[PDB]
Amino acid sequence: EFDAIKIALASPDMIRSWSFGEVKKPETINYRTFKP
Amino acid sequence: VPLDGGRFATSDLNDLYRRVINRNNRLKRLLDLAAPDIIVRNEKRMLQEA
Amino acid sequence: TPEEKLLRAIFGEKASDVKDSSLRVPNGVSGTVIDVQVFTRDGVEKDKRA
Amino acid sequence: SQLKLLVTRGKEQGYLTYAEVNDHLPEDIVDSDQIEDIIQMINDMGIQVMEEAPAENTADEDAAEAAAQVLSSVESEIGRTTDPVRMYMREMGTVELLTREGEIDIAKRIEDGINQVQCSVAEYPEAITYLLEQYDRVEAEEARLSDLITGFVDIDPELAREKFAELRAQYVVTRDTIKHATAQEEILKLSEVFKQFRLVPKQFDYLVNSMRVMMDRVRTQERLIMKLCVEQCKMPKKNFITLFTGNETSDTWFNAAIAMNKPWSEKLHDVSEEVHRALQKLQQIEEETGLTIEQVKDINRRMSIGEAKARRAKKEMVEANLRLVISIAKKYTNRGLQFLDLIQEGNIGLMKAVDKFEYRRGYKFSTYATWWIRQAITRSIADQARTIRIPVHMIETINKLNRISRQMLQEMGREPTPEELAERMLMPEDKIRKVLKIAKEPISMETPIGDDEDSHLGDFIEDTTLELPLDSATTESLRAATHDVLAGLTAREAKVLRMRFGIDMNTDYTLEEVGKQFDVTRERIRQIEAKALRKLRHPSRSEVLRSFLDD
Ligand SMILES: CCC[C@@H](C)[C@H]1CC[C@H]2[C@@H]3[C@H](O)C[C@@H]4C[C@H](O)CC[C@]4(C)[C@H]3C[C@H](O)[C@]12C
Numbered sequence A: 001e002f003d004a005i006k007i008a009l010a011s012p013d014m015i016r017s018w019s020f021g022e023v024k025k026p027e028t029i030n031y032r033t034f035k036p
Numbered sequence B: 001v002p003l004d005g006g007r008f009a010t011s012d013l014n015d016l017y018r019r020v021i022n023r024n025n026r027l028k029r030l031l032d033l034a035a036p037d038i039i040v041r042n043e044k045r046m047l048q049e050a
Numbered sequence C: 001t002p003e004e005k006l007l008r009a010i011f012g013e014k015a016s017d018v019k020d021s022s023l024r025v026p027n028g029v030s031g032t033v034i035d036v037q038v039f040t041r042d043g044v045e046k047d048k049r050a
Numbered sequence D: 001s002q003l004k005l006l007v008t009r010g011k012e013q014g015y016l017t018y019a020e021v022n023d024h025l026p027e028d029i030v031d032s033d034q035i036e037d038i039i040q041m042i043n044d045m046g047i048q049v050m051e052e053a054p055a056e057n058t059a060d061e062d063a064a065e066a067a068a069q070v071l072s073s074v075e076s077e078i079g080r081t082t083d084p085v086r087m088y089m090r091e092m093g094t095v096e097l098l099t100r101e102g103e104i105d106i107a108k109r110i111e112d113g114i115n116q117v118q119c120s121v122a123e124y125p126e127a128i129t130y131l132l133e134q135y136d137r138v139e140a141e142e143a144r145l146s147d148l149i150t151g152f153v154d155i156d157p158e159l160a161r162e163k164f165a166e167l168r169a170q171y172v173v174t175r176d177t178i179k180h181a182t183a184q185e186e187i188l189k190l191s192e193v194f195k196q197f198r199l200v201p202k203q204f205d206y207l208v209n210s211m212r213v214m215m216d217r218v219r220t221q222e223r224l225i226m227k228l229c230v231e232q233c234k235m236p237k238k239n240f241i242t243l244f245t246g247n248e249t250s251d252t253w254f255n256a257a258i259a260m261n262k263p264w265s266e267k268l269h270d271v272s273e274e275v276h277r278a279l280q281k282l283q284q285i286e287e288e289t290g291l292t293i294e295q296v297k298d299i300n301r302r303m304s305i306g307e308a309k310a311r312r313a314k315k316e317m318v319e320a321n322l323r324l325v326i327s328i329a330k331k332y333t334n335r336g337l338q339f340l341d342l343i344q345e346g347n348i349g350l351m352k353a354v355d356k357f358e359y360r361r362g363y364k365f366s367t368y369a370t371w372w373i374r375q376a377i378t379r380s381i382a383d384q385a386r387t388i389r390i391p392v393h394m395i396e397t398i399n400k401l402n403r404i405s406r407q408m409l410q411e412m413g414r415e416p417t418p419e420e421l422a423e424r425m426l427m428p429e430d431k432i433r434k435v436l437k438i439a440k441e442p443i444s445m446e447t448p449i450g451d452d453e454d455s456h457l458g459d460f461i462e463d464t465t466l467e468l469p470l471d472s473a474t475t476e477s478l479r480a481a482t483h484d485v486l487a488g489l490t491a492r493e494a495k496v497l498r499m500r501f502g503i504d505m506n507t508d509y510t511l512e513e514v515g516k517q518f519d520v521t522r523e524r525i526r527q528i529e530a531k532a533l534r535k536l537r538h539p540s541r542s543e544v545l546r547s548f549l550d551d
């Protein structure tokens, strides 16, 4: 499958490419319905 | 993860992420209030620390 | 699943809807029960054995 | 020097003692953290603190040289501080406090600035039409009478309606009397009579923002023209000042400036279309403004000056009030939020105070603030102090119970009971148990639980959403057995069963589509399915499928 592991600094464009969305609230879960 | 008895166990990274997000949101809100530059400088220092 | 539905159909067996989270002797141990004690909350009914 | 002497031994022995380091340490007073900073700086080349007197070298020279250079800088340093709170105290310890008369001057500066802003927005009375339309819609019962406007500068709805009627009369008698020598006086009178009214901050701000949007559209058009006539054509600014300024409405300054026998005039032929469109938009907007743009420009300049004066005014008020918040904040140091966080949250409540403070009532600020500050600290400690956010109401209730409980314990020499707590409070007892369950803060998953292998608590928490491997083998065994018992059947019935239930496919087709393909009307396909089922039901064709029936 893979034959090497390359390492380098990450550009902001790359960091946005990894992500599936932006976290905007410090919330974790609801305190009664323990749902996200 | 939920534990027995209603207790919850959490990783320390959640605390650090919550710190970062709180200070970032506060900074964004404070930029829109045109606060005195002392406040925004201190907020930026806090964000850097977090 | 698609084959666990057909199996339940042919044999007409319905879902239990409850688990079997019962206490059992640890494997490899063999003794006699010499004592049992039950503690119940205030609002509970204190079943016959209690 | 002193640091170099300390290094001398470090290397000579390969190790040093806390005392010798602290002593050779430059007298340079260090605020603990600084001493902490240098210790690692020395550790960079590698050294053993060892509170007591005494295991190999693995330090790159590059690290070594850099640590040496920074170590030299430490001696030359004066007041290096790597601590935000300390830096804050210093940058704050640079503004003097204000005396009692020191807020009256600031307050009157603020009032004068806001009055100038109000008049400047008042001068542009086109909004009066928008205000009248809003009042008409409100009188159409679209909203409350008292919501649109917070009264007038006078106390009864009838007086407000009379004033609105007079305003409408003046508006109609002034708008339809432009034909110019006296129209300006009519407009001034209309503005003056409108000054006696008071508008809600939201509607006033919306009007200001709409005016700003219009002005920014006009400025965008002007700058587009400037970039299309200067950058592309190198048009001298003198020509623009001479022609564009003075009229600012007609096309003479641009369209009739093409015949100036200059290279820029000829080059304007290429960009005449876009600049002409900009001029058309301006002509319309200039008509919409109905006022000399230069006058408007001066209106905006005065408004900006007033706003800047007001902003710098409160700035100083809030600098002395930053001098404060530090006190109230220290009262919640261990409440689950960090000190600099508490202080910054208080600074926002302080800003909220300064903007809503009236000195006329002669309240000591240091009192129209010590509240706004505490409200903002507590609101925060409640909205962002726990990993699982709790409503402010639930937090109030929990604090009340924790108190009522302390008193009951002191007067009972015994922790109260969920029943006695319910009695002493006014709660249905079950509610008390629900509030007495709201789990406290999540436990740290790295909490040391060791003394054998240095293992943490999170290591012993298992995964409960995993399929056991004898259930993955069992599943594949049924997915096969089913193929056998089913294949041991004729084609059409086997496909009927396959479609009905979903074996090897991607949908549990209902009877309608199965009939479409097999041509029929449900009841027959229902017939084919039932025979198959009763068939696979008899023994001699359902022993292993029976085994898969947990029993
Ligand atoms: C001293 C060694 C550390 C470890 C053995 C101690 C230190 C803190 C203890 C936990 C905490 O109290 C929080 C919970 C309290 C509940 O009642 C029982 C579970 C719970 C996780 C405790 C189990 C255990 O006792 C812990 C992990």
Ligand SMILES: CCC[C@@H](C)[C@H]1CC[C@H]2[C@@H]3[C@H](O)C[C@@H]4C[C@H](O)CC[C@]4(C)[C@H]3C[C@H](O)[C@]12C
Residues within 6 Å of the ligand: B003, B004, D449, D450, D457, D460, D461, D462
């Ligand atoms: C020597 C240290 C003792 C350590 C082995 C004991 C002390 C407390 C025990 C944990 C707590 O009960 C909390 C959880 C309860 C779950 O049901 C099972 C996991 C869980 C972590 C427990 C596993 C283990 O039993 C623990 C860690």
